[model samples]
Target: ILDIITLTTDFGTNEGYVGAMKGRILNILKKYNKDAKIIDISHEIKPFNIYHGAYVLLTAIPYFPPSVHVAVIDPTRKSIVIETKSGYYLVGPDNGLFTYVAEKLGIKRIIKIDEERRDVYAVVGAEILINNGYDGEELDEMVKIDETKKRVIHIDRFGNIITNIKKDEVTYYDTIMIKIRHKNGIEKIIKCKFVKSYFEEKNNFICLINSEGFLEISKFMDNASKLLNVDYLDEIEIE
Candidate 1:
């Protein structure tokens, strides 16, 4: 029995749309004879920006207990159910919003939707999969997606830029020293340090393994993006 259902969407709480959908989901789950808690991964995704939605989902889903991740970034596209090799269910649209997260989790199968239902589509899909016990043989194979090699995906309000590159890829010369070079066409080179946390280095630019396990570029209590002149999807290189 599925015990959790998480909602990740671009629908901000400025209106009643998100709340109404949650109510509908709560109503729908009553028939399953299962008591599952419904939670929001986030509703503050940039309006209609599928990439932001995708990146948010990719970062947030991994930390949650295995549950149904219902993402509603693009409603125009068809909705689908994806079962991951880790035994979690991801219900969302077929658009690229699910690309990075699905690939990272290792998709087991994709369940195609025959009808259109928008936000409620994912809620229903979660119910069906939960009721039916998520059989792999009944689902379709995964699709291929060409994600970026090293793109910045998130920039928090604090101005920290989060990239898709993992921390293990960086070669450390010491506990606090590494060479970084901008991607091709730029001759700029800099030496940065990996601090365990922001408090370790009070007032300098740093690249550290953030809580999400991604290499994040930030400064102590300062806006790193503004300081480094970087933004989302900007490519970078490290040595």
Candidate 2:
């Protein structure tokens, strides 16, 4: 069977940046080598934001089949191809990009996603790793960031600020207070009603546990992130 490959990048659409990378992979795979596949996890990660790219991968890895997931962000100490204990491969940077996901999935060992061309579209490089299945050692360490520290995981088009904090953490509350600190060094404290659903028919903003089981803040028919003056990875504290 062909090795499955998924792509994650900060290389936005409309630009040939992603196209060039995919074309290279397709050209190499055209060697009649089981005719591989490529799935776009996302090419829309905000430029250089590793956390957002990592979160996208985290959300996707569990659902995808045993395959190679190639992630490209910022730059790297070259690149790394991680073999997960669950049998998925993460092809990305060595600069802690795969840290959280690797830590969660359990690292089988690092194939270290490469070649000279492998320096860029490591997807092609990873396909070969599937073949040779050699070249590796182990130290088993990755940098850590605080996942427990609540922060915006994703901001929806409707302006819902989805947080990394679990819904059950606030299950005892009827209302909650949140303090958000922006990178600009300013902050705001919000007192919002904790509602069960988004369509509460109130003009005021509401906080709720979204489908993913994460706490989110949103305004009915409005943009909560804008109104709250916060952005992705912004520091959040609630009580």
Candidate 3:
């Protein structure tokens, strides 16, 4: 089977960080699986936005040959998502990121990473790659799966971003801070109540934990990208 890896990160196009991460993974593969292939989903994710990371991965991971090694560089959460024919595997910190993606994709294997399993992690990641590239009926026993409410679910063209901002993350009549990453290095923050439309609000922008316990932002019929000059996935602070 062809060994392959896909990288998703909040890294902008300017820096060498993305190159270095690929190099590190490649260096490891060279020492073990010399023929492994690597795919770059996008190195332009807004910085530090785990939800954006999740949304991007959600769109691309399903397209890759199953069992690709997905390394996410959102940094707020450290983990990798391994896709399998039967289901997906999430290995990394318990932070909301991995769990968030798992919840979205129905993750089947949730492997906790640690030193004792260093070899295990590598081998499993490789096995997924091999299985997808070729054909294999062999299946490994399954792992425990869990879900989280914190995930980057959607983004509108108007530079408006939404997340799995569960009710627990919100408060009635309380104005919270929303911080998102901008390629231009500018900060955009807005305050509003938990309502459906922006026209009914006091501010030009509004935020609320939706029925799905996710947070979303929008400006009716306006291109948020042009108004804000930011990407949907740019980093954000829900608090």
Candidate 4:
């Protein structure tokens, strides 16, 4: 299978930046490996906000093949990098945008995401870890940042999206829930240990299980905004 190339950027799709970047990658791939398969995760995050882009990538990247090369560019004027559970690459500028996420998936060797490097990209660097010697050992050798914290992984499709946090981290009582208090009067919460398939409930439903597997509120086929009143600006808090 073609290694997935995930792009998480603060560049909104409404502009040409996202398309231009894709074009650049495609052109490079065409010249090198005509069979390259590229995957676009998001180009619609707020400008320069690495956290937003990083959160989205951390949640979504696992859904791709394990060896996928995730590249992120936050509007904070940083560069992109290629990282997997086995190895790492310093593709973009060394902005802190990738710090936590790179650790989450486990960094191997963070080389510059450049094709010119004999072994980094090797040949266009599209195939991912190919000839690059990313053998998953690098995941253990990679450094972990001190301030890096995982916000639990919530699996959407089927598997549980859980983080490194354990059940012991929770505070008893407190009616634990992932509450979203929208600008409007809409409020949503999902009690702990709630798990169900898509569309198992109705009326702006809340899944007890979150992406990172603690407590989460989500509505299927419906944006939490219109259905459960989850707003973008609203704080996704645990209460």
Q: In model 2, how many backbone clashes occur?
A: 5
Q: Which stretches of candidate 3 lie over 4 Å from their true place?
A: 74-93, 116-153, 156-221, 225-239
- What's the true lDDT of residue 24 in model 1? 72
State the lDDT of candidate 3 residue by residue for 1-239, as single tens digits: 54456666566768876676666656666665557666777776666655555566656665555446444443432333334435544333333444344545665544434343323333445445545432223223332222242433566545555665656656645556666656567777655455755565644566655434566766556654566555543556666
Q: Which candidate is the best by lDDT?
A: 2
What does the lDDT come to for candidate 4? 0.48
Task: Kindly report which residue stretches of model 4 are placed more than 4 angstroms away from their true locations once superposed.
Answer: 68-70, 76-91, 112-167, 172-209, 214-239
Query: Per-prediction count of colliding residue pairs?
Result: 0, 5, 10, 24
| Model 4 C-alpha lDDT per residue in residues 1-239, reported as the tens digit of each score | 44555566666767786666667666666665555466667776556655555556656765565544444453332133445554434334455555556766676465443333412322334544343333231222322323434343322322223333444554422234565554666666655324455455544344454435444445556544344433233545565
Residue pairs with colliding backbones in model 3 are 51-152, 158-223, 158-224, 158-225, 159-224, 159-225, 165-213, 165-214, 165-215, 181-235
For model 2, the superposed segments whose C-alpha errors exceed 4 Å read: 75-78, 113-119, 123-134
Per-model root-mean-square deviation over C-alphas: 3.9, 2.6, 8.9, 7.3
Better of 2 and 3 by TM-score: 2
Model 1 lDDT, full chain set: 0.70
Report every candidate's CA lDDT.
0.70, 0.73, 0.52, 0.48
Off by over 4 Å in 1: 31-34, 133-148, 172-191
Expressed as tens digits, the lDDT of each residue in 89-181 for candidate 2 is 776677767766787788887754335343354544445534734344554555555676778877876878988888667653366788888
